[PDB]
Design a protein around this ligand. Sequence first.
Ligand SMILES: *[C@@H]1O[C@H](CO)[C@@H](O[C@@H]2O[C@H](CO)[C@@H](O[C@@H]3O[C@H](CO[C@H]4O[C@H](CO)[C@@H](O)[C@H](O)[C@@H]4O)[C@@H](O)[C@H](O)[C@@H]3O)[C@H](O)[C@H]2NC(C)=O)[C@H](O)[C@H]1NC(C)=O
Ligand SMILES: *[C@@H]1O[C@H](CO)[C@@H](O)[C@H](O)[C@H]1NC(C)=O
Ligand SMILES: *[C@@H]1O[C@H](CO)[C@@H](O)[C@H](O)[C@H]1NC(C)=O
Length: 497
Amino acid sequence: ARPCIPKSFGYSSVVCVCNATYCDSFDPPTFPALGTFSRYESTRSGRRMELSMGPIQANHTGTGLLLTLQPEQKFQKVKGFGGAMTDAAALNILALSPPAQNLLLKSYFSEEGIGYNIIRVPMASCDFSIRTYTYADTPDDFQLHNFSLPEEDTKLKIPLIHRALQLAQRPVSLLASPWTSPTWLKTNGAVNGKGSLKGQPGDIYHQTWARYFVKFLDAYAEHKLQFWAVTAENEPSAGLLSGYPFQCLGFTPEHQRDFIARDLGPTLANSTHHNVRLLMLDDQRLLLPHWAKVVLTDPEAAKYVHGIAVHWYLDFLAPAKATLGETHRLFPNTMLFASEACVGSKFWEQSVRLGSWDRGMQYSHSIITNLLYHVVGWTDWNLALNPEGGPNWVRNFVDSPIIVDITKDTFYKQPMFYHLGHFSKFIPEGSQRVGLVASQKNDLDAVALMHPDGSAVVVVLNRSSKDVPLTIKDPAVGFLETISPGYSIHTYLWRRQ
Ligand SMILES: *[C@@H]1O[C@H](CO)[C@@H](O[C@@H]2O[C@H](CO)[C@@H](O[C@@H]3O[C@H](CO[C@H]4O[C@H](CO)[C@@H](O)[C@H](O)[C@@H]4O)[C@@H](O)[C@H](O)[C@@H]3O)[C@H](O)[C@H]2NC(C)=O)[C@H](O)[C@H]1NC(C)=O
Ligand SMILES: *[C@@H]1O[C@H](CO)[C@@H](O)[C@H](O)[C@H]1NC(C)=O
Ligand SMILES: *[C@@H]1O[C@H](CO)[C@@H](O)[C@H](O)[C@H]1NC(C)=O
């Protein structure tokens, strides 16, 4: 286990400094015997996923906070965690020397790092691109004879995805999302702004756009990559907004419903890519449950839709119970998945705050809330950005868990990286959320899950300044006596037999 090299940039915590010859890492799991628990601890004060071990006791007495596992109370199975291979993320990763590149990719994808198993791939350009392009910019090419991947895919994104896959010991699921269609399929003839597909679902424009999904999946397959899922459109509501500056393609929920039932669903189902999952919405969770009711109460759209993808940007408006909770109650067999998050887009937010503990706590708080309301996965946005929070052709810069400094062949792992790793490292695909109750009112955020191998994992986040002593009870093993320091996050692991 190679320790964090801390550096302060004047914010609430430190970054971990990595370069060509040094990056912090973990040792392989030792799997401690029954009656012993593992603790991974990160703190604002500087601890970075530090391992300790403790005993499990047969008995407990006291008035302190007790959290009780309810292993019989079974909820959602986890798909996984990861981030987005944008043009910007690829340009930043490839600006490092090869050994620094490999330590960045190992930080995310290896067992010596945090075990990411999801990669979101934009279908052509987004704002985190240095130029605007689609795969079919030759005008009025309804045949899509001139559909091709440019070097952003063939030289940047695809080779980095292959390298990530090879470093990962877990199977990695790829998720594709489009921002815009070719401009000649759009009402406004532009990559951005208020504009939809021309015409109506079931017509030549919509059939062409559905076939474009199949051509993308064919082109990626020529490069030996297969997708787990695609979304119906990135943030479809954004294309309904006058002057929207980012690549977009506007759909009402009715438009998405009919596009899926008539065009996208049947087109994917009648392709070699029929096993690729389709996710609807890919948008702010305040749009639930309405968007789910509009799409999923139509059997001709419902039969194609595997899940509902959500973005976190307006979560302050949208209580989880009224959105995720209500959507799970009405549509319990349609999985919910968090497909995009980042801090810093808002005009008042500094784009990049190197070492921000607040930004880390935003991530872990969101992941815990999502898991407590039936969500099966959580996806970061750009895997890496430069210290300006780009590149970005619209100059809408944001933060990333890893910041690359090309001038020093150095990258910085922020608190967001460690807060995400407290889940991604320890909650593999197939883990199941289980019950966890508190003995009294408390300021902690906590979630319990069972690993496929039956072992327990509990994440405890303390967003308060105050140390909170607490006990965890598992009826199969006994009591963990621990303490949740102010501004900390813990992951607890233990065998149950
Ligand atoms: C990539 O990042 C690495 C981590 O920051 C950089 O390594 C640091 O490199 C400096 C410059 O050589 C080292 O400092 C020197 O340290 C030695 C003492 O060495 C011994 O003790 C230190 C702890 O004090 C220990 O880290 C070493 O293993 C040795 O046991 C002094 O003699 C010098 O006066 C000077 O202070 C750092 O120790 C070193 N840290 C680590 C953790 O390796 C590396 O240089 C970066 N590479 C590039 C090219 O940017
Ligand atoms: C521990 O738990 C058991 C429950 O079977 C209880 O009967 C026993 O007296 C407890 N031990 C102590 C020291 O309280
Ligand atoms: C588009 O495709 C056809 C046939 O493969 C080719 O002859 C034509 O010149 C291409 N157009 C452009 C603009 O590259």
